[PDB]
Each structure stands twice: as structure tokens, then as C-alpha cells.
Symmetry: C4
Subunit: 387 residues, 4 copies
């Protein structure tokens, strides 16, 4: 085993090739599939895994009742191989958690699982399944983290956590973790910014995170930093607005776009100089559809012009959260860090007339070979028997 270097650049990509689809909700109509939300993908040097927050319940069973609820003592972070349904019969137990992150440094898995009360939650860090550190809420108001993979460079892994209001100014911290132990942290000085649910990836030995402003931004905030946690902050400038909800596309801002700014959805983007690959919902108002857009000046420029759009999920179909994941050269044999992404396809409450909420997933990897747009939706027929 060798630590992931993390020192190559992100691979340039022209489009997105489909990588996985689990069909979890369709399969759970009969099979024994966990009720889950907040899935994400992360890879080791040998395999990729889907992590997810269970609700300690199975689909089509009465204990799925009320699973719109975000935080409970029953939620657990578990993982299974990519593309398989999350069952009790194929899932590794990771941590007790209602908010999470995970990443592999080339040697072992780091998992971060937050549980406990809203006023005093505690993140439990594990390295190779052994508890190695904890960090407690510093603002006493729902300590919470990425819901996607952390990022690793040369034996150090990095994450972001938030504590404070989800509808006003909060507090945001960056962490450097080695072998599951926090070795450095800093509080971001980000007045008038809001960071939730960061999608962070490594690129040329530095970390870039694209997040969710739940307070007053319909474009996405970003934070980038080096191994010593020297950081920069901004908002994606493109008028191709990335959040949901959002306005119709128009001239953007390099600060928070107030129009339709409150609320949000976890997402991601990939920076390539001045340009950006944006994944977003197709609907401006609801978690419906998904598309990939290449805007060659959208990181730093405010116009609403773009060059390429690739369809992923059709506008009338359910989508949900999305997040980055990477494939390092140690896994692929390539000379660059490959960007990939996943989409959560949320079924049930609040939009559908069920007792439960759960998701399935799809994922894609960036290539420079030919690709095509389509719709790969969840495909379950609701309601279910239990509803």
C-alpha cells in the first residue's frame, strides 16, 4: 500500500460516460434494501464504494415511516460496492451517523460520522474502522459535514464542517486529518458567505470545494486551499446558476446571488482555470432533472453563455443531491486525476404521497472520448404497498 500522491492535475474532459446505476428503489419494492439518503461514491486504489446514510429501516416496511426526518439515533453510515443496491446482506457498517464523509488515503479508509443531539453533536473519526479522533460541535447548532467524499493528498485528507444556522450566517471550518487524527484546523473568515455540504476534490496538490449556500445564494460558494490550510473563497461567477432553487439564467455574480437564494441542494462543480463543468438540476424550482454544462469562462465570468450541455436526467424526472468523486492515477493508471460525479434520485416525501423518503443513484466519469446525453431516472412506481 502507498499513499495517494494527489499531485497531478484534473484530467480535461469533453463529456461524461455512464459508470453506475443501482436501481435501489425499484429493487426494494420486493428485496431487502435500506431506506437511504445522502449517498456518495468514494474510491480506494482498488475499488469504488457507495456510502450512504441509512434510516435503520428497509423499503416497503413500516419502519420506513417518517423518513423525511433528517436526524435520529437510528441513522448509520454504511457502504457497499458501487452499483449494488444497499442491503443488509451486502453492506459494511461504517459509523453511527446522520451526517458523514469518507475518503481513502491510499492505505486505509477514513470515515467521519456525526451523531448525538442537535445542540452538541460529535463527529467520530475512524481510520480502518478504529476510532482515531472526535470533534464536538463548536456552535451548538447541528454540527454537520459534506455528505460526499473528503479529499486526500500525500497522506493528508481534508474536509469542511459547518455549525450554526442554515438560514443565516454560520461558522465553517477546514480540517486536515492524517491517519484519522485531526492535525490542523482553521475557521474560514467568510462573512456574508454560506457553506453547506461541500463537494471537495484534489487537483495539483490543493483542494477545491464547491458547496451549497442555503442562506442567500442561488450560485454556489467555493473554497480552495493548500495542505497548510491557506485558503481562498468566492462564488461561481457564471450566470448559469448552479443551485436549486435558482432564477432563470441571466447575468451572474462573483458573490452570492440573492434571487431565489434561500434553500438549496447539495451539488458540485469542477474548475478548469476560468472555466467550469457545472452539474445542476434542470428545474429552477424543484429537484427535477439533471444536466452537465461546460462554461469555458464560468468560474470567473458572469455571462450566461455556455458551450456544451449534456443531459443526464430528464426535466420531468426526480433528481436530488449530487457530488464529485475522483479516481486517482494509483487506481486508473492515468497521468491525471479523473473527475466523476454521482446523482441521488430522491423518491417519496415531500413531493410524492408516501410515508417514506429514499433514493437511488447514478454515476458518471469524465472522458475525452465520445459520449451522449440521455435520461437515466430512478424508475420506481410509487406509491408502494406500505403506503
Amino acid at each position: 500500500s502507498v499513499k495517494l500522491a494527489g499531485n497531478s492535475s484534473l484530467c480535461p474532459v469533453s463529456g461524461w460516460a455512464i459508470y453506475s446505476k443501482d436501481n435501489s428503489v425499484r429493487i426494494g419494492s420486493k428485496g431487502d434494501v435500506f431506506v437511504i439518503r445522502e449517498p456518495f461514491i468514494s474510491c480506494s486504489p482498488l475499488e469504488c464504494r457507495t456510502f450512504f446514510l441509512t434510516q435503520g429501516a428497509l423499503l416497503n416496511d413500516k419502519h420506513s415511516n417518517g423518513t423525511i426526518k433528517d436526524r435520529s439515533p437510528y441513522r448509520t453510515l454504511m457502504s457497499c460496492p458501487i452499483g449494488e443496491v444497499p442491503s443488509p446482506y451486502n453492506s459494511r457498517f461504517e459509523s453511527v451517523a446522520w451526517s458523514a464523509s469518507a475518503c481513502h488515503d491510499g492505505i486505509n479508509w477514513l470515515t467521519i460520522g456525526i451523531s448525538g443531539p442537535d445542540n452538541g453533536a460529535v463527529a467520530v473519526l475512524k481510520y480502518n474502522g478504529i476510532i482515531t479522533d472526535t470533534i464536538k460541535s463548536w456552535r451548538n447548532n447541528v454540527l454537520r459535514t459534506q455528505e460526499s467524499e473528503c479529499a486526500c493528498v500525500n497522506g493528508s485528507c481534508f474536509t469542511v464542517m459547518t455549525d450554526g444556522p442554515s438560514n443565516g450566517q454560520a461558522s465553517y471550518k477546514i480540517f486536515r486529518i492524517e491517519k484519522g487524527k485531526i492535525v490542523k484546523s482553521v475557521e474560514m473568515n467568510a462573512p456574508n458567505y454560506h457553506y453547506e455540504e461541500c463537494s471537495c476534490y484534489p487537483d495539483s496538490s490543493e483542494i477545491t470545494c464547491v458547496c451549497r449556500d442555503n442562506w442567500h445564494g442561488s450560485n454556489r460558494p467555493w473554497v480552495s486551499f493548500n495542505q497548510n490550510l491557506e485558503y481562498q473563497i468566492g462564488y461561481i461567477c457564471s450566470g448559469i446558476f448552479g443551485d436549486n432553487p435558482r432564477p432563470n439564467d441571466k447575468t451572474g455574480s462573483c458573490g452570492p446571488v440573492s434571487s431565489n437564494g434561500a434553500n438549496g441542494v447539495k451539488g458540485f462543480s469542477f474548475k478548469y482555470g476560468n472555466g467550469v463543468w457545472i452539474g445542476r438540476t434542470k428545474s429552477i424550482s424543484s429537484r427535477n432533472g439533471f444536466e452537465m454544462i461546460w462554461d469555458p469562462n464560468g468560474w470567473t465570468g458572469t455571462d450566461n453563455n455556455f458551450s456544451i450541455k449534456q443531459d443526464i436526467v430528464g426535466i420531468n424526472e426526480w433528481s436530488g443531491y449530487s457530488g464529485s468523486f475522483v479516481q486517482h492515477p494509483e487506481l486508473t493508471g492515468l497521468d491525471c486525476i479523473r473527475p466523476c460525479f454521482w446523482v441521488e434520485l430522491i423518491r417519496g416525501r415531500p413531493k410524492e404521497n408516501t410515508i417514506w423518503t429514499s433514493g437511488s443513484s447514478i454515476s458518471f466519469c469524465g472522458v475525452n472520448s465520445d459520449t451522449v446525453g440521455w435520461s437515466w431516472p430512478d424508475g420506481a412506481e410509487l406509491p408502494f404497498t406500505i403506503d
Copy 2:
């Protein structure tokens, strides 16, 4: 790990010994078994696996409705150990796919999964589960492939894909793939031929494929080629016609036999000089029954005489697709490439009054020791509870 050499000849065989039977449909009446079609077997130097195209659904569940439909965004290529039922609890996720192939080069698995819209489908190639290439539709008319194993010689693996009409002239391409990357391709110049769903195997460092003419041939077309993709084409000459439907046996042709030539079924045959081992249905008109026939001059000669017939599935029982698979010396310890075959046993629509279509499988390997004919049919009692 060492590349398969693929340089020995096919083992001579006098009969077919039963190797596996999964009983999937029987077991799926209660257990959590995928709705599948287009199964196939392929081996590594250590094990054999069943690959298959799921429908993103389980047997005896409502989401199995409409599974006569061939292409959807829910279909996935997955695999499980040979002889086990395909379940979410024992199946490896391979690719998102409504047409597929796979093969092991001695080092890692190559999978090929085609998804996307009919007018612009994309094959995603993976090597050890990592995307290594893509190829897009070149005729914009259902890019499609073998539905059985590709063939590997000395670190290069080979497949055939078709694009264009299934009821007229189409376009057929041969590919050479190394570590999941396309390194050579050629378009077969085959006016008046039709190639679908090729069953391809290695034999003395060259590849032989026996395929399905869906346009106007009731005998099977073949294509053989070396590593440089220098190819030859023809049709199996025997009057023991190989396709389904077909006429009653009579004097054959080394070109397409027009009588009952439209439509077809995936199949295979094994060439031994002038001779041929033909696997075919027992019914001339329907996907019923299965048998193996040794015709010692049937590759190159048009008579309707043969020497051996071995019963596999009775004429009153449902059959389906069939395909070759091989066991190389690196797996068996033999001095020759062993020929084997599988049969898909299709249940449900259109022949039976169900909401769904699914298959089970049986397989056999060639031996020079004593064998026997019998019928090993699917055995499920239809309809099911869901119907």
C-alpha cells in the same frame, strides 16, 4: 497474473457434459432474483461467471411489468458465479447496458456495456471496472453487440458490433482491444450478409465468430480473423440449418438461405476443419428445445446429413439464446482450448401470459468421454403471483 496465450487449438469433443444449471426462475418465485435476459458465461484463469442484462427489477414484483421491452435506462450488466441465481445479494455490478459483452485477458476483466438512446448509443468499455474507452453509434441505429463473451489472444481481446437495420443491410465492425482501449477496428465489407449477436471464440491465435442473420438467412453467418483484423466471411454450408426460425433440413447454401430467413435467435457453432458442432433449437419455428449436432462436413458442405445428435432441452420446453464460451489451458491445465456452451431458457412474454419476461440458464462443456442426452428445462410453473 499472466495473459492468456490463446495459441492452442480447440479441444476435439465427442459430446457435451452438463456443467451448470441455475434454476433462476423457479427460485425467483420466492427469492430475490433479478429479471434478466441475454445471459452469458465467461471465465478467467480462476473462475467462471454468468453475466446478464438485468431489468432493474426482481421477479414476482410489480417492476417486472413490461420486461418484454429490450432497451431502457434501467438495464444493467451484472455478473455472479456460474450456477448461482442472479440476486442483488450475490451479483457484481459491471456496467449500465442494454447490450453487452465481456471477457478476461488473463489479467483483468473487460466489460462492454451499451446504453443511451437508439439514435446515439454509446458503448462504455471498462478494464478492471475502470472506464477505459467509449465508442459511439456510427449509423445512429441501435449500436449493439454480442450478448456473449469476447475472445482474447495474447493480451488482445476482440469483439463485433453492429449498427443499422435488423431487417436489411447493416454495418458490422470488428474491434481489437488491449487493456480496455480500442487499438484497431475495421468495417466488414459484407454486402448481402447480416451479422447480429456474434458468438466468438479463440482457436490457434485466430478468432472465429458465428452469428445471427436477422434479415434473410436461416443458416448462420460467420466471420473469422487474425490479430491484425484480416478477416474472412461466409455462411455455414450445412443443410442442418442453425437459426430459428428455419426450414426443415434440406440441401443448404454457403450463402444466406432465404427460406424462413427473416428474424432469428442468437446462437453459436464450433468449427473443426470441414466439420461443425451446431447447437440449435429443436423446433423449426419457435424457441423450443435444444440439441447439439456434429456434422463432419457441415462447415463447408451443403448436404443435410450429420453423424451425432445429443438432446439438451426437449422440443416441448422453452429455450432461447445460446452462446459459446471457452476454458483456456491456463484455467484447465489442458493442452487445448476447451469449448463449452450455455443456453438461455426464456420464460414469460410473448409465449406465456405474464407481465414479465425473464430467463434461466444451463451450460455444458465438451468432453471426449461418455455423455448422454436429456432435457434440462427451466421448470418454473407460470404464471406467477404477480401476474
Copy 3:
């Protein structure tokens, strides 16, 4: 890996310590557990496995209907770790089979699976899952074999097969198999003997088999042989009669005991000079109960006196088949071959009012430390929902 020597003597034992219990039928009331009969245990240098003949159906499903029937094209030889229920989700596929044997030579598993028609059945031999030989019926009347483990000494494994009537004189052959290939066979010259379903074990480089006389013997026949297949034959002389059905105990015979001789049950015994450890049902008329009896002169002496009885299953509870299995020094670290046994606990038809027949199992290993009698029955409550 090293071949099992097989040259030590059987360990002397004073009693039987409980080793496993699977509770398969109780668990299959809800879970996905195969309908099985003819289970047996066999060990490698690293683990022990339960082998069994499925009916290609699950408990409590309609396809379990009619499973009193012995031979069908749906039956398969599968295996799982000892003590686990046989499910599609934990079982390795071995062979298509309605009669079987298996054993590990220290390097790889040999499996023998007989399928095909009653008049022409064929045993398929596999070594490490690859077909290595076949043998066809020589009398055209249900070729059949042990339904328990074969026996291995120094790289050679040994079995017995029968072909011919189960109610009159038949033909019995001994086989020596190396790396899955038959290298020698002999027909036993056993006029007036009847051998079915032999339980064979190694002891000081020679094989001893204790079998079932279905024709006219209520004591058990035996055959012992060396590596060159030089054999001896006899019947267990004890008046503690071993078969079921049988008479009440009384003076025995060193030939077949005619009283209640027709029919039978598979069983076993362990020879220790003139003495014998006999496992038998408690009922003289039905497959009910089970007990272990130490008769210090019962191999060669005809009295009905014995020294020790250990209860295993109570007289009012269902039992079934039983068989030997051993644990070699390569597995245990001991200086002798440890004797063990299993019992099949048959539920359903013919004795119970169900549509199905299936079994669970228990097993024990011989020790020289303290032990105790009890009853470890199946414990399912019949009928089931499907009945």
C-alpha cells in the same frame, strides 16, 4: 497446499461432541432456504462444508411441490459453510446432480454429480470446478453413489457406485480418482450382497465403507480396500442391527440379516478392530430418533450386547440419513484421523401432510473428553403456509 497423507489411524473416541446445527427448515419458514435432501459434510485442510442436493426450489414456495420425487433435471449439488442454512445467497454451485459425492485431497475439491435419464445416467467429475472425467451407467438402471464424502489418501480419492436394482442383486464398483480423473476401477464380486449409499472413510492408508442393503439385509454391509483396490467384503456382525427398518435386537449375522431386510436408510459405522461405533435410528420401523452405540465386539461378533449408548435425537423426533465425515491431521493438528458424523432430519413427505420434503442437519465429532446425550431435533412446526 499439500495432499492429505491419510496414513494415520482413526482416533479412538469415547463419545460425541456436538459440532453443528443449521435449523434450516425452521429458518426457511421465512427466509430463502433451499429445499434439500441428501446433505453431507466434508472438510478441506482449512474448512468444513455442507454439501446437499437441492430441488431447485425454496421452502414455502410453490416450486417445492412434489419434492418427495428423487430424480429430476432441476436437482443440483451445492455447498455452504457448515452450520449455515443452504440459501441461494451463501451457497456455491457444484454440479447438476440427483446423486453425489465430494471430497478434498488437500489441494482441490473433487465433486461427483450424476444426472441424466434413469437408463443412461452420467457421473460428471470436477476437480476445482473444472470437468475432469465422466462415467456412464454400465447397467442402465439408475447409476448412483454415496450421498456422502469420498475418501482420500496420498493424492488418490475413492468412491463406490451402484447400478442395477434397489430390490435385488445389483452391480457395485470401486473407483480410484486422482486430480478428478478415474485411474482404476474394479467391480466388486458380491453375490447375495447389496450396497447402496456408502459412507467411506480413510484409516491407516486404507478405505472402509459401511453401506445400506436395500434388498435383504437389516444389518449393514461393508467393503474395505487398499489403494490398489484390493478389497474385502462382509456385513457388520452385531445383533445391534444398524439399518432402518430392522428387527428388535437379537443374535446377528456376519451375512445379510433377512428379517425386515428390504428397504433401508443411508448410514455409517466406524470400525475399531473387532469393535464398532454404530449410529442408528431409535425406531425399528421409521426414520425417528438417533443414537450412537459402542459395541466392543460388534464388527465381528453376533451378540446383542453393547457397552455405551449416547442419545442424539429422541425417539419421537424425525431423523433421516446419516454419514461419516473425517477431520485429517492436516486440519486439526492431531496425530490421528478424527471421526465425525452428520444426521439429516427429514421433514415433510411421506410422514407429514405437506406438499414438500426437505431436511435440516446436525453433526458431531468424536472426542475422548466428556460428552452427553440429548435430543437435537429439527424443531420446525409443520405444516407450513404453502401446504
Copy 4:
């Protein structure tokens, strides 16, 4: 593989970080989950496992009827990875048992499973799954053991067993076991003490056990000993009484506290010089709630003062047994033996109106970093469909 040294001291700990939660009962409402009680955790140098006593039945099936009953021939010791539900599809079979212990010496697992009749029960010892010893009841009155992990130092593992009344003086024995063989034992001379269900851990090459007085003590008895089995005995002195039932806290005793002393619950404590970490129920009278208390003089001092309390399960929620488990340096990389604990959350009879009794579990590990109190209860909604 190397023997665990067991020569470092217990790690000092300021609080308890949540490690696992299985949600078994919730999941078993639909999935195939064993009815279990008497779970426990134990670790190797590579992983931690949950061991448990099944009832040979699944939740929400008829065979779960009557599972308030403690001892039957259907109960089996099995194990699964920590945090996963105990299912037939993920559980290793260990032993036939209605009382058990297990522990890993660094090389292989030792399991101890007691079965047989109440008047003559036999413990079967296995090492790497092979029977290595037995010990029979010496008082003919329910030979029984820890229901939690045994303790290993330098290749010797240690346990305690009891035989005789649970409501009066009984007989208690300590065992030293090497490679699954009993090499030493001694009968504890403990007139007027009562020891049941010991929770034993290693600490500086010696073993400390904290147990249950079911006769006449509401504080917990302890026994400590070196590798030669030279032992000391006493009761935890603290007026923070550890058993359930118990009185309200008040001045304690270093002998058995008679008030509310009959009956009990399995538990544990960790000694740190004069101090103690006590895990106990929150209710004085019922198996409800759970908490950890640090009493810095509570091992040797009788006051009812303590310094820290951490909430684990709320007073209105069901709890159950609890026990210690450790993580050795060979697993963690630490310089001390880490203390952890599990809690069984009992559902069903006698407190709830069901046909069955079963449990789920939670576990925590000791840390010197920040922690928080909460309630992590079972969460199933009873009764179930079967009731």
C-alpha cells in the same frame, strides 16, 4: 499472525464515543434477521465481530414463538461483522449453544458453546472452528458462562463458568485455555458470593472480571487473577450500585448489598486503581435506560458520590445486558488496551405483548477526546405482524 501480548495497561478514558448500532429489530420487521439474545462483541487483530445466541428462528416468523425461553436444542452461537444485522446470509456458524463465550488470542478464535440438558450440560471448546476440548457440568445444575468475550494474554485465554443455583450459593471456576485446550482450572473459594455472566478483560497481564450476583447483591462482584490463576475476590464498593434491580444510591458495601439483591442483569465495569467506570441501567427496578458513570473512588470506597455521568439510552427506553470488550494495541496501534462496551436492547417478552423476545445492540469505545450523551435506543415499533 502473532499472539496478543496483553501486557499494557487499560487506556485512560474521559468518555465514550459511539462505535456501532445494528438496528436489528427494526430491520427484521421485513428482512431475514435472527431472533437473538445474549449478544456480545469481540475483536481480532484485524476486525471486530458481534457474537450472539440465535433461537434457530427469524423475526416475524412463527418459529419466533416462545423465545422468552432461555435453553433449547435449537440455540446456536453465530457471529457477524460488527454493526451488521445478524442474518443467515451474513453470519458465521460457531457452535451449538445456549450459553457462550469467545475471544481471539492473536492467532485464532476460541469459542465456547454450552448445550445439552440442564442436569448435564457440556461446554464445547473450538479453536479455529475445530473442537479442541470439552468440559461437563460438575454440579449438574445449568453449567453456564460469560455471554461476553473471554480475555487473552500472551497466548492464554481465560474465562469463568458457574454451576449450581442462580438463587443461592453456587460453584464458580476459572479456566486457562491455550489453543482451545484447558491447561489449568481452579474453583473459586467464594462463600457468600455469587458470580454469573462475568465481563472479563485484560489489563497489565492480569484479568479482571465484573459479574452479576443473582442471589443477594445489588452491587457487582469481581474476581481478578494472574496467569497462574491466583485470584482475588470482592464486590465493587461504590454506593452507585451497578446491578438491576438495585436500591436508590446510598452508602455502599465492599461485600454484597442485600437490598434488592436477588435477580440481576449482566453488566460490566472497568477498574482504574481506586476508581471505576460503571455502566448501568437508568431505572433502579427495570431493564430501562443506560448510562456510564465515572466514580474516582468507587472501586474501593463506599460513598454515593461520582464525578461524571454520560447518557447512553434514555430511561423510558428498553435496555438489557451489557458487557466489556477491548481493542488491543495489535489492532489499534495504541500503547494501551482500549476499553469498549456494548449494550443489548431487549424487545418483546416479558415487557411487551409479543410472542417473541429478541435484541438489537449498540457499542461505544473509550476516548480522551470530546464526547456527548444521548439516547440511542432500539427503535422498533412493537408488536409486529406475527403477534
